[PDB]
Amino acid sequence: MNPPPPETSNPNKPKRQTNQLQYLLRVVLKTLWKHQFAWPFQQPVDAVKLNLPDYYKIIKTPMDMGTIKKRLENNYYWNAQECIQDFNTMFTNCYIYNKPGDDIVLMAEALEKLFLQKINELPT
Numbered sequence: 001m002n003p004p005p006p007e008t009s010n011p012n013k014p015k016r017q018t019n020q021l022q023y024l025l026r027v028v029l030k031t032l033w034k035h036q037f038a039w040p041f042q043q044p045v046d047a048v049k050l051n052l053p054d055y056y057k058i059i060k061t062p063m064d065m066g067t068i069k070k071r072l073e074n075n076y077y078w079n080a081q082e083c084i085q086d087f088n089t090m091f092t093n094c095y096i097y098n099k100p101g102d103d104i105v106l107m108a109e110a111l112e113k114l115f116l117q118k119i120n121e122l123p124t
């Protein structure tokens with residue numbers, strides 16, 4: 001079975017909107033989303049659809065850009081670093097579940113480089 005996807009709202013968690021979080025949605029997320037290699041990362045891994053019955057036996061903190069997008073749209077994050085951590089979790093999950101040289105690992109490496117390029121300088 002698939003696990004529940006990560007929460008995109010939580011009334012127990014305090015919200016915030018910052019210039020950096022606005023930039024992370026308008027610029028970083030929405031630019032990465034259009035990359036030719038973004039498609040594996042635009043939704044939670046559907047292990048039933050993709051016939052990956054070991055995916056969630058290995059990956060215990062799943063994350064994807066669709067979840068990140070919803071979290072940004074909901075002001076779920078307190079600050080930009082919290083959002084950056086979710087991106088880094090998404091990339092590392094890919095490297096953990098797969099192996100060096102795999103096509104999807106090449107995709108995540110390219111997206112991670114573009115991600116780092118975009119967050120190198122954030123607004124103030």
Ligand SMILES: CN(CCCNc1cc(=O)oc2ccccc12)C(=O)c1cccs1
Pocket residue numbers: 039040041045050052093094097098102103104105
């Ligand atoms: C080795 N593989 C297949 C590994 C299993 N497939 C996936 C692994 C993963 O961590 O995330 C995914 C996300 C979407 C679709 C397939 C996968 C690949 O290189 C490719 C997976 C999808 C694009 S190329």
